[PDB]
Amino acid sequence: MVLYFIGLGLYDERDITVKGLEIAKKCDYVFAEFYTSLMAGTTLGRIQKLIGKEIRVLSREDVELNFENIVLPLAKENDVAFLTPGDPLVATTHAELRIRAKRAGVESYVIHAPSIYSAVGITGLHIYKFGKSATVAYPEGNWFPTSMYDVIKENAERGLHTLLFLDIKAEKRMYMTANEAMELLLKVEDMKKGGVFTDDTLVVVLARAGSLNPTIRAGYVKDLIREDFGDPPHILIVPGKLHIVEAEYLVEIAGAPREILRVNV
Amino acid sequence: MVLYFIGLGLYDERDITVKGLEIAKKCDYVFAEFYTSLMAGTTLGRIQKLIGKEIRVLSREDVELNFENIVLPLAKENDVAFLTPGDPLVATTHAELRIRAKRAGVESYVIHAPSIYSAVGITGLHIYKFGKSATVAYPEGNWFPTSMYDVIKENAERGLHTLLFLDIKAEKRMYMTANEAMELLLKVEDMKKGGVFTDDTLVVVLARAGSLNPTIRAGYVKDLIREDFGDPPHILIVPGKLHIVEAEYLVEIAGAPREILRVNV
Numbered sequence: 001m002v003l004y005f006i007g008l009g010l011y012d013e014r015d016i017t018v019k020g021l022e023i024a025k026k027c028d029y030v031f032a033e034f035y036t037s038l039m040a041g042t043t044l045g046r047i048q049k050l051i052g053k054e055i056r057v058l059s060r061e062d063v064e065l066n067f068e069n070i071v072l073p074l075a076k077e078n079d080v081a082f083l084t085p086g087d088p089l090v091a092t093t094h095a096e097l098r099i100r101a102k103r104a105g106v107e108s109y110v111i112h113a114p115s116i117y118s119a120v121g122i123t124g125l126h127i128y129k130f131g132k133s134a135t136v137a138y139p140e141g142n143w144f145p146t147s148m149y150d151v152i153k154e155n156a157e158r159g160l161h162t163l164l165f166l167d168i169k170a171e172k173r174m175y176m177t178a179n180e181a182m183e184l185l186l187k188v189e190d191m192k193k194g195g196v197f198t199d200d201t202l203v204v205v206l207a208r209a210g211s212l213n214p215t216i217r218a219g220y221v222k223d224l225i226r227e228d229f230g231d232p233p234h235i236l237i238v239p240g241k242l243h244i245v246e247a248e249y250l251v252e253i254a255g256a257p258r259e260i261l262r263v264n265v
Numbered sequence: 266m267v268l269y270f271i272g273l274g275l276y277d278e279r280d281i282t283v284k285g286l287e288i289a290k291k292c293d294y295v296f297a298e299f300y301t302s303l304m305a306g307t308t309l310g311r312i313q314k315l316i317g318k319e320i321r322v323l324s325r326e327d328v329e330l331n332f333e334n335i336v337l338p339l340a341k342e343n344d345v346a347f348l349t350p351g352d353p354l355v356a357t358t359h360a361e362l363r364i365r366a367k368r369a370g371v372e373s374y375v376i377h378a379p380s381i382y383s384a385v386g387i388t389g390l391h392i393y394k395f396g397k398s399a400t401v402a403y404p405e406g407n408w409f410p411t412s413m414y415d416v417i418k419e420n421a422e423r424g425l426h427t428l429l430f431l432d433i434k435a436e437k438r439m440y441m442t443a444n445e446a447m448e449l450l451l452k453v454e455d456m457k458k459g460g461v462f463t464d465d466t467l468v469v470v471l472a473r474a475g476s477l478n479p480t481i482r483a484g485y486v487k488d489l490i491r492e493d494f495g496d497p498p499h500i501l502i503v504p505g506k507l508h509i510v511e512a513e514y515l516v517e518i519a520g521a522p523r524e525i526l527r528v529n530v
């Protein structure tokens with residue numbers, strides 16, 4: 001009698017780990033949420049098919065307000081599993097749910113899955129060189145988010161790369177593009193003129209990580225802010241000072257201007 | 266005419282994604298490497314039975330010096346797979362291999378899998394608050410590494426968490442423990458007296474991630490320095506200032522002492 005946190009992966013249903021599939025296949029009740037990220041290459045049907053169980057989907061409100069009412073209860077008598085895109089505990093507040101589980105007298109286990117946070121390694125940028133991370137959020141009301149700007153500034157000053165999580169509103173089916181983010185940033189630039197994010201800043205975009213053919217592009221903002229990378233989800237990265245080997249991967253694989261090959265030491 | 270970089274996961278032969286397995290089976294040749302890391306929770310033999318293909322294990326020199334002489338040739342006329350622990354491209358040196366694949370006129374695809382870099386999310390610490398990452402390499406002869414120490418310093422300075430990869434001797438099959446890593450850090454503290462890592466520093470240890478029974482513990486060095494965290498591999502983490510939720514998780518789940526609720530928050 002337990003509760004399982006299983007990640008479904010980056011793109012399609014096949015991105016679940018074997019461990020995760022075997023275990024999902026033996027649980028009595030299987031819940032899931034699809035609001036923390038977007039798996040562009042699959043459908044609830046295929047997941048349900050692959051697993052072999054009916055998956056009751058939950059909304060942000062069900063999860064955040066009644067997890068212990070809807071899911072935890074069954075967990076005491078049965079073997080329940082909660083599915084989520086990517087890795088269940090990366091860039092979500094699901095970790096807290098484990099405390100609910102404990103306090104509800106329920107044993108919980110975690111089955112990891114490929115996360116966008118580590119998939120960025122496909123851009124050639126050294127993983128250890130990524131600093132703090134941030135999320136470009138949808139502007140709303142009379143307030144224009146600005147934190148993500150300072151973060152890029154802080155990391156850049158230290159020579160670190162910045163991972164920018166783009167926003168999502170599942171219910172409204174809104175998936176921020178790298179373009180919608182490059183614009184939101186250029187605006188924060190003018191508001192602060194910090195030299196952080198301009199038209200000559202180098203940027204890398206990763207779209208549909210997990211698919212066989214993700215869109216990996218690196219270039220100056222001016223030349224990319226008006227490009228079609230493809231369907232979502234999109235991720236934006238503002239690199240710091242590149243290593244020669246990083247620059248070479250970006251040029252040879254990501255299609256960046258040959259000029260970055262010449263790094264400023 | 267195609268090369269696949271498939272990730273093997275975190276601990277056992279089941280940490281591979283259904284994607285990576287289905288593909289690995291459809292390959293004419295399968296290579297692997299276990300020098301960047303080690304699947305402590307399985308064996309090459311158990312892995313070979315899951316894939317149902319034999320696997321030629323490549324040494325470090327093999328890959329870094331003659332990848333284009335051992336792997337790429339067969340990739341021209343067949344579909345070849347290259348297995349590596351964790352998620353590919355998280356080992357900085359693997360990325361450049363894709364360039365070589367192109368140079369030799371070969372298609373290369375990447376099949377991600379759970380990485381320790383993202384799995385750390387299970388510690389209850391927020392992913393975005395992780396800063397630059399470092400590695401605690403085994404000292405040798407007159408050599409006494411110290412960069413890691415500074416990496417911690419710069420991160421916690423900015424309220425960021427520090428993920429410390431512990432060293433490994435693949436061949437000799439020798440895992441560095443969290444305890445050992447702590448002793449090394451305390452030794453650098455005494456050498457630089459920066460206040461960065463002391464008997465009162467709070468740390469989190471994560472052992473055997475990916476397993477259903479990983480060890481997750483959090484406390485002050487003076488109590489974890491000699492604590493037994495179980496079989497390898499080990500990962501050490503020096504957290505920055507904690508959000509009340511991280512602290513609660515570290516207490517409710519990682520058995521951290523209540524003191525952290527009022528000291529490290």
Ligand SMILES: Nc1ncnc2c1ncn2[C@@H]1O[C@H](CSCC[C@H](N)C(=O)O)[C@@H](O)[C@H]1O
Nearest residue numbers: 010037086087090115116165166208209235
């Ligand atoms: N497959 C993918 N490709 C590119 N970006 C992705 C992605 N999956 C998620 N993202 C990015 O991350 C955001 C969701 S945050 C949730 C991440 C998920 N928990 C994980 O472990 O991967 C998306 O809005 C997008 O900005």
